[PDB]
RNA sequence: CGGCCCCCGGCGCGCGCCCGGGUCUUCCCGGAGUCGGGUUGCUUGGGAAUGCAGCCCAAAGCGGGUGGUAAACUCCAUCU
RNA sequence: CGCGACCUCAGAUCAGACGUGGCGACCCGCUGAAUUUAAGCAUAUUAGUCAGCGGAGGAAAAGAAACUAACCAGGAUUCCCUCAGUAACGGCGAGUGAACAGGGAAGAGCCCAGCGCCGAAUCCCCGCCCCGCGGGGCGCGGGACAUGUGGCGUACGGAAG
């Protein structure tokens, strides 16, 4: 009983399933590249804003720690992914000792 | 193998290794001339992802640009117009500084053709860019038909017309809903077409 | 400056508009110019057809136009893959290819695949010196004409169905009404809200 | 130190890469005997040393290299700064030699910034294995400490002399 | 229409170059003081900022950009 | 103390080349007013136009998506007819004001860095020659470039073995 408005909208056609376009697999980690970036964060180190960040993230609190990364790196959605990868440095330093 | 490490090492320019050698040479660059011919690129990965090859005919210049926006060159701040044009001191010069930096590099060497450039240090006053250049008349350039495009005479002085990737960012062109202020050709080629009276013959 | 009952008007002539005027006096002089750009191209090519390659069946976007069929850009890889021809050999056959086009329906996928096999069976190629791989004898008895016109297989051909006559039965003259629009129109907008009250009674305990 | 570095270049001297002079005749000797006997494999193993940062980095992270000679005076030092940290992790022994002009003359060039040892001769493995424990004593095993060692930060002699003259005055104050 | 003189695009002897396609299996897969955020000028129909530029802060990698009302949550689309 | 290398740099009426200035109708990059309109006038409008400055070409610029879309989906740019004096901007005053579908003109696509692979397999210059016209070479032997990376196969529509 097909109709144009509603929750089951539109002319009912059948889907073409296919392997996706190759450019959409663009920022994958590709383990060799994971090796390169992880080899280089121990020859080089951490930025001065993010060494001050993990010295709030171990003792002070986390809500004031994210509000700090909110300001230096731009958005909110970048601030949480930066915060949970600092907490995983802080876990690998402490909890693997 | 090498250049992926050189890229990723460069992409963290606040760590204690990298902010050392980004200012042990920002001093060394500052003591030289306004423009100076470098003998070889100071970051050979970024040159070759911008079109450089290591053979005869290509040439890098590092040049220096004084930072800051432009002051309106007007006597004693008196602009003599309506109050919306008292703008002496907050004016921002809508073309980029790197496009300025390529422009006074290919101006000194008018026999050279300019491809594009990149960043190699900034202080508080000066900003330093390595500009890469191409001799159109050397036979390592005038052969090799994947390089013969630049020795074709429409590419004379590409940055005074705004054609390089440093300079074409200032024209505001591209596809999109965010960039259809220049949806025919260029910025004023849209304006001429939007503001022409297109009266036909039978109207 | 106004008067009795008339229109309030915004003519945009407050700008220096006599400089940017475009008068079309050369417009017959250019219509007879780009005829010559077609004729002296059509005999310039070959018995290869005029007006370029073959285009796909393509349905238009944007609800106003989605009921019709347009000629597109290129057939693309998915449709070229099923038809059997190579993605870079296809444009010396005379078939345009648009690799950035997607197929997400199967009805319109098979339409252009049926279109593209129909083309190759009414195409005759010319081997250079007559070895003829995948080609036979004398060229379709000299190919019955020379050069085509404004589209190979009449690319729009917007066609509709017959659906001749039915008898009005029960459950058909009873149900599918205006009310089924208004209820389905309401159920789409009260859908997210009612699934929020459903969470509230699940946290009720 | 120069005694090891001279032993190292003695070892690397007969693994010298191919020059264009001997590349002419090497393609002759392959082609005149193939024209006479058609050898299925005349030489199973021509050994040689590789050259180049971009080639060495491929060898170390595939662990194909057996010793990585690395230079000293690379002008953009970030072309080389990752490579000692990387030979530790892939476990390849490395040694910093003095002067990128000198190992550049091995490869008949001007500067070459790195060479690598992949397949030494098995009869002369015993010279490569001799100094490799003398080397990975000094570089690879010390990596916990050589990564901690800061550099520079000594005052000039005209300003550290007045440091000492204040300390002698403090030394003359006490006794 | 004829005759003259020169110039031009394309058939055939001698150089030069020359293994493509499908299926499966394994491995590879990307551009940084850039994106972005702040603020400040200009500009735009672009309005809780369309574009550009200065200065400051400055990224990620199932990421990033866009989806025309600022924000948090989510799903989907689309591009690289 | 001498010598050798290399890096950074100098000099020369060095060998061989190149850039300059003009014209500027159209085209590209910036810079940029005011008269005027609002019945006054500041935001606005005139106008991102005049003047100023720099670069080209027989065309230039653009251009093969970090797109439009929101449905049965289209598929680089440029031009036309529409959309439309419309959504929107604005002392919400005067005024200003694009786009996407759709119809046409024309239609064409590609390449690198990177990731690996091949003994730098690559290029320039000189010298005598195959042998030549109207001169350019693939062939020969020397000097350089080049491993801080030339050349081949490869580019996101996937690719390689
Ligand atoms: Mg040189
Ligand atoms: Mg009329
Ligand atoms: Mg001319």
């Amino acid at each position: 009983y097909p109709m144009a408005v509603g929750l089951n909208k539109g002319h009912k056609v059948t889907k073409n399933v296919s392997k996706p376009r190759h450019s959409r697999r663009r920022g994958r980690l590709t383990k060799h590249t994971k090796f390169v970036r992880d080899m280089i964060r121990e020859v080089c180190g951490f930025a001065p804003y993010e060494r001050r960040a993990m010295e709030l993230l171990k003792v002070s609190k986390d809500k004031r720690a994210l509000k700090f990364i909110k300001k230096r790196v731009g958005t909110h959605i970048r601030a949480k992914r930066k915060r949970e990868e600092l907490s995983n440095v802080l876990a690998a330093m402490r909890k693997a000792a | 193998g090498a250049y992926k490490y050189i890229q990723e090492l460069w992409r963290k320019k606040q760590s204690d290794v990298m902010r050392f050698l980004l200012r042990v040479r920002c001093w060394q660059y500052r003591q030289l001339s306004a423009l100076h011919r470098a003998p070889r690129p100071t970051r050979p990965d970024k040159a070759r992802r911008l079109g450089y090859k290591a053979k005869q005919g290509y040439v890098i210049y590092r040049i220096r640009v004084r930072r800051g926006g432009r002051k309106r060159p007007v006597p004693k701040g008196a602009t003599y117009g309506k109050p919306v044009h008292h703008g002496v001191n907050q004016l921002k010069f809508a073309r980029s500084l790197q496009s300025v930096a390529e422009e006074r590099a290919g101006r000194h060497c008018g026999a050279l053709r300019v491809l594009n450039s990149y960043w190699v240090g900034e202080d508080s006053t000066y900003k330093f860019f390595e500009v890469i250049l191409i001799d159109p008349f050397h036979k390592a350039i005038r052969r090799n038909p994947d390089t013969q495009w630049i020795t074709k005479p429409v590419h004379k002085h590409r940055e005074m017309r705004g054609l390089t990737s440093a300079g074409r960012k200032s024209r505001g062109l591209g596809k999109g809903h965010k960039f259809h202020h220049t949806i025919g050709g260029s910025r004023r080629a849209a304006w001429r077409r939007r503001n022409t009276l297109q009266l036909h013959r039978y109207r | 400056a106004p008067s009795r009952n008339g229109m309030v008007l915004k003519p945009h002539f407050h700008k220096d508009w006599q400089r940017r005027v475009a008068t079309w006096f050369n417009q017959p002089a250019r219509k007879i110019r780009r005829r010559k750009a077609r004729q002296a191209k059509a005999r310039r090519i070959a018995p290869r057809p005029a007006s370029g390659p073959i285009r796909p069946i393509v349905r238009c976007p944007t609800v106003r136009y989605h009921t019709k069929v347009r000629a597109g850009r290129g057939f693309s890889l998915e449709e070229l893959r099923v038809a059997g021809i190579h993605k870079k050999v296809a444009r010396t056959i005379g078939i345009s290819v648009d690799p950035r086009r997607r197929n997400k329906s199967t009805e319109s996928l098979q339409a252009n695949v049926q279109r593209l096999k129909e083309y190759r069976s009414k195409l005759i190629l010319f081997p250079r010196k007559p070895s003829a791989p995948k080609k036979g004898d004398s060229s379709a008895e000299e190919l019955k004409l020379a050069t085509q016109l404004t589209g190979p297989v009449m690319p729009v051909r917007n066609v509709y169905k017959k659906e001749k006559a039915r008898v009005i039965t029960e459950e058909e003259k009873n149900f599918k009404a205006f009310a089924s629009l208004r209820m389905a129109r309401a159920n789409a907008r009260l859908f997210g809200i009612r699934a929020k009250r459903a969470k509230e009674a699940a946290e009720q305990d | 130190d120069r005694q090891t570095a001279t032993q190292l270049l003695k070892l690397a001297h007969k693994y010298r890469p191919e020059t264009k002079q001997e590349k002419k005749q090497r393609l002759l000797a392959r082609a005149e005997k193939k024209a006479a006997g058609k050898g299925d494999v005349p030489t199973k193993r021509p050994p040689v040393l590789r050259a180049g940062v971009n080639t060495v980095t491929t060898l170390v992270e595939n662990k194909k290299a057996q010793l990585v000679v690395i230079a000293h005076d690379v002008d953009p030092i970030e072309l080389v700064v990752f490579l000692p940290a990387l030979c530790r992790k892939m476990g390849v022994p490395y040694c910093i030699i003095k002067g990128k002009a000198r190992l550049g003359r091995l490869v008949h060039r001007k500067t070459c910034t790195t060479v690598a040892f992949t397949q030494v001769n098995s009869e002369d493995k015993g010279a490569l294995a001799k100094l490799v424990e003398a080397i990975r004593t000094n570089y690879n095993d010390r990596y916990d400490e050589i990564r901690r060692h800061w550099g520079g930060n000594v005052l000039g002699p005209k300003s550290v002399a007045r440091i000492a003259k204040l300390e002698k005055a403090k030394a003359k104050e006490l006794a």
Side-chain angles (χ1 to χ4, degrees):
Chain A
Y1 299 172
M3 60 182 71
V5 83
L7 186 60
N8 300 318
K9 287 169 93 289
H11 196 196
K12 295 284 104 174
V13 299
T14 175
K15 293 178 72 175
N16 190 6
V17 291
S18 182
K19 177 170 62 66
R21 297 179 75 246
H22 185 71
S23 67
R24 287 192 176 184
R25 199 260 290 152
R26 179 63 167 86
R28 288 295 305 269
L29 190 55
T30 179
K31 294 181 287 187
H32 179 77
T33 302
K34 177 182 84 272
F35 175 75
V36 175
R37 297 194 181 102
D38 290 330
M39 201 282 299
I40 210 148
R41 297 188 72 84
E42 55 94 12
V43 77
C44 194
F46 294 151
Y49 79 102
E50 62 186 357
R51 293 199 306 269
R52 193 193 180 279
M54 67 176 69
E55 67 94 21
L56 306 176
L57 188 62
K58 61 165 65 68
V59 285
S60 177
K61 277 298 104 176
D62 305 337
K63 187 256 187 65
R64 184 260 186 96
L66 182 139
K67 189 175 76 176
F68 187 76
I69 306 299
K70 177 74 67 65
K71 187 170 286 292
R72 307 187 74 87
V73 191
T75 69
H76 178 71
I77 204 66
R78 291 174 186 266
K80 299 198 272 81
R81 186 174 294 109
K82 178 65 78 174
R83 190 266 307 276
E84 71 175 357
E85 76 181 4
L86 290 176
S87 182
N88 293 319
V89 171
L90 198 63
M93 183 271 289
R94 179 66 187 91
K95 304 299 190 287
Chain B
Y3 293 111
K4 189 65 176 293
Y5 292 98
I6 320 292
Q7 177 180 8
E8 200 78 34
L9 192 273
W10 199 272
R11 291 170 70 175
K12 292 185 290 297
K13 56 177 75 71
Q14 279 190 356
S15 73
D16 56 351
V17 42
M18 194 63 213
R19 69 181 298 169
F20 173 72
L21 80 156
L22 197 68
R23 68 179 174 87
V24 79
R25 70 180 74 243
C26 183
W27 168 80
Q28 185 262 333
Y29 293 159
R30 191 165 67 243
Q31 303 296 323
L32 288 173
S33 298
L35 61 93
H36 170 68
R37 177 173 180 181
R40 58 177 62 249
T42 56
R43 39 185 293 181
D45 54 349
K46 178 72 171 174
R48 66 183 297 155
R49 77 183 68 254
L50 266 64
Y52 180 79
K53 302 298 185 72
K55 57 184 176 181
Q56 292 162 349
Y58 295 172
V59 47
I60 318 296
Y61 285 7
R62 87 275 296 269
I63 83 107
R64 179 184 71 190
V65 166
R66 176 176 290 271
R67 291 165 63 102
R70 71 187 295 276
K71 183 177 186 291
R72 182 171 286 169
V74 72
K76 294 187 176 71
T79 323
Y80 296 160
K82 293 174 185 295
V84 69
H85 297 87
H86 289 311
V88 183
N89 209 357
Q90 296 284 322
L91 264 286
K92 258 54 177 290
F93 186 64
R95 200 176 72 187
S96 61
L97 287 168
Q98 185 176 355
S99 179
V100 173
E102 290 171 353
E103 196 268 327
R104 66 187 65 186
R107 187 67 172 272
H108 183 73
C109 299
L112 276 302
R113 302 282 173 84
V114 203
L115 195 54
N116 44 1
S117 68
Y118 47 84
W119 182 87
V120 282
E122 69 190 9
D123 196 0
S124 179
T125 300
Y126 295 148
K127 192 177 283 187
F128 295 94
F129 293 104
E130 298 288 338
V131 182
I132 92 102
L133 281 297
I134 291 176
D135 193 0
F137 281 21
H138 193 275
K139 299 292 184 182
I141 316 298
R142 186 163 275 262
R143 276 74 168 265
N144 194 4
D146 288 329
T147 318
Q148 285 183 355
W149 63 268
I150 197 161
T151 179
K152 190 257 294 300
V154 72
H155 298 285
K156 296 169 99 287
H157 290 171
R158 298 176 60 191
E159 283 92 1
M160 275 80 86
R161 311 202 303 271
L163 263 69
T164 63
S165 69
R168 72 168 58 243
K169 288 176 92 286
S170 168
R171 298 165 64 188
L173 51 89
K175 291 181 284 292
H177 74 282
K178 291 162 100 284
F179 298 107
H180 61 262
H181 182 73
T182 151
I183 204 63
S186 59
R187 182 181 56 77
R188 64 179 289 269
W191 183 83
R192 179 174 174 272
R193 187 260 318 283
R194 267 85 165 275
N195 278 308
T196 184
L197 178 61
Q198 199 75 39
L199 51 80
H200 295 93
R201 195 175 55 159
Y202 308 94
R203 71 191 79 167
Chain C
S3 179
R4 282 79 171 269
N5 205 5
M7 191 81 78
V8 50
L9 292 168
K10 308 281 189 177
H12 296 84
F13 285 175
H14 293 276
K15 200 177 287 187
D16 194 0
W17 62 276
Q18 292 176 355
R19 295 183 63 190
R20 278 81 37 74
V21 71
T23 56
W24 287 9
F25 293 138
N26 52 9
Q27 78 92 23
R30 76 165 67 194
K31 282 199 286 184
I32 62 103
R33 182 165 64 243
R34 72 164 71 96
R35 291 182 78 248
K36 294 178 182 178
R38 288 190 289 277
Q39 299 180 358
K41 172 252 187 68
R43 77 180 70 94
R44 184 188 61 79
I45 297 173
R48 296 198 292 267
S51 72
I54 183 166
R55 303 292 179 183
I57 297 300
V58 154
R59 183 167 296 275
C60 297
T62 66
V63 195
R64 175 174 174 180
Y65 294 100
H66 76 291
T67 71
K68 69 182 285 186
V69 164
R70 186 176 62 86
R73 171 69 172 266
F75 283 112
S76 74
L77 326 174
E78 307 71 349
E79 300 172 356
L80 302 167
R81 179 179 181 269
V82 177
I85 58 172
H86 184 74
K87 66 178 177 291
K88 291 188 288 297
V89 176
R91 71 180 67 253
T92 173
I93 298 301
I95 293 169
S96 66
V97 176
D98 187 66
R100 71 174 70 90
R101 196 269 199 95
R102 299 171 291 110
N103 296 113
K104 69 181 187 178
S105 178
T106 311
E107 292 291 330
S108 66
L109 176 76
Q110 297 296 322
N112 292 316
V113 173
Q114 184 63 252
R115 180 175 175 86
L116 201 62
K117 296 190 266 79
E118 191 265 333
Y119 170 74
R120 180 61 180 84
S121 179
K122 66 191 294 184
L123 170 61
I124 37 98
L125 276 71
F126 289 151
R128 276 84 184 275
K129 297 288 104 177
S131 68
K134 277 86 171 186
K135 177 60 179 63
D137 59 357
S138 174
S139 295
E141 285 85 7
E142 281 81 10
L143 79 105
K144 193 73 176 177
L145 63 95
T147 305
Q148 277 71 12
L149 280 305
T150 182
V153 289
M154 299 167 285
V156 273
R157 186 57 70 188
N158 196 356
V159 289
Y160 289 144
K161 276 77 181 174
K162 178 173 169 64
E163 290 171 352
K164 77 290 293 180
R166 295 174 66 249
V167 176
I168 32 97
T169 184
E170 185 64 26
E171 187 67 25
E172 182 173 359
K173 66 174 74 170
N174 196 7
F175 182 68
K176 192 194 287 183
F178 173 78
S180 297
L181 275 78
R182 298 288 297 164
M183 291 191 289
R185 184 176 296 277
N187 290 327
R189 71 173 180 86
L190 292 171
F191 178 69
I193 299 174
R194 283 172 176 166
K196 188 75 177 295
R197 281 90 182 275
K199 299 300 290 182
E200 199 276 333
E203 61 94 24
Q204 187 63 38
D205 190 3
Chain D
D1 57 351
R2 75 196 69 184
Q3 187 181 6
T4 306
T6 306
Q7 288 289 320
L8 177 62
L9 298 178
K10 191 267 296 298
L11 187 274
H13 182 76
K14 59 188 178 182
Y15 290 161
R16 181 177 290 276
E18 188 168 359
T19 190
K20 192 177 261 79
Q21 284 295 109
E22 71 187 4
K23 190 262 290 181
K24 182 260 291 179
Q25 59 179 356
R26 201 274 309 279
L27 269 299
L28 285 174
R30 188 69 183 90
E32 296 293 326
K33 196 265 293 299
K34 182 72 165 62
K38 295 184 287 185
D40 58 351
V41 42
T43 304
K44 69 186 78 63
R45 300 294 179 186
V48 76
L49 60 84
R50 301 289 187 89
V53 183
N54 204 0
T55 300
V56 162
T57 305
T58 301
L59 292 175
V60 184
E61 73 190 3
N62 292 322
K63 293 188 261 72
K64 300 285 104 176
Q66 297 295 320
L67 190 272
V68 178
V69 181
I70 186 165
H72 174 266
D73 196 2
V74 182
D75 305 335
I77 207 65
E78 73 264 8
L79 285 177
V80 168
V81 76
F82 63 95
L83 208 149
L86 189 139
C87 292
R88 194 265 301 171
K89 195 166 182 66
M90 292 295 176
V92 176
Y94 68 94
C95 60
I96 294 168
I97 198 165
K98 281 294 192 71
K100 71 180 182 292
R102 177 174 54 178
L103 79 153
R105 287 194 290 112
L106 294 175
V107 73
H108 301 289
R109 205 166 303 127
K110 294 192 283 190
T111 60
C112 72
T113 311
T114 36
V115 304
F117 285 145
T118 64
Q119 293 299 107
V120 300
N121 291 318
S122 64
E123 70 272 14
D124 300 337
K125 174 67 169 62
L128 180 273
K130 177 176 181 292
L131 51 88
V132 73
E133 277 84 8
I135 283 172
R136 70 183 302 161
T137 300
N138 290 309
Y139 294 98
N140 294 98
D141 289 330
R142 297 179 64 192
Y143 187 75
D144 291 330
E145 180 179 356
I146 199 166
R147 182 175 173 268
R148 183 65 70 186
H149 187 201
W150 290 94
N153 197 359
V154 284
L155 284 80
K158 295 180 77 173
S159 63
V160 83
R162 78 191 69 185
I163 291 171
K165 192 168 70 175
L166 283 172
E167 290 295 325
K168 184 176 70 66
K170 193 179 293 293
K172 196 257 190 178
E173 191 270 334
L174 199 148

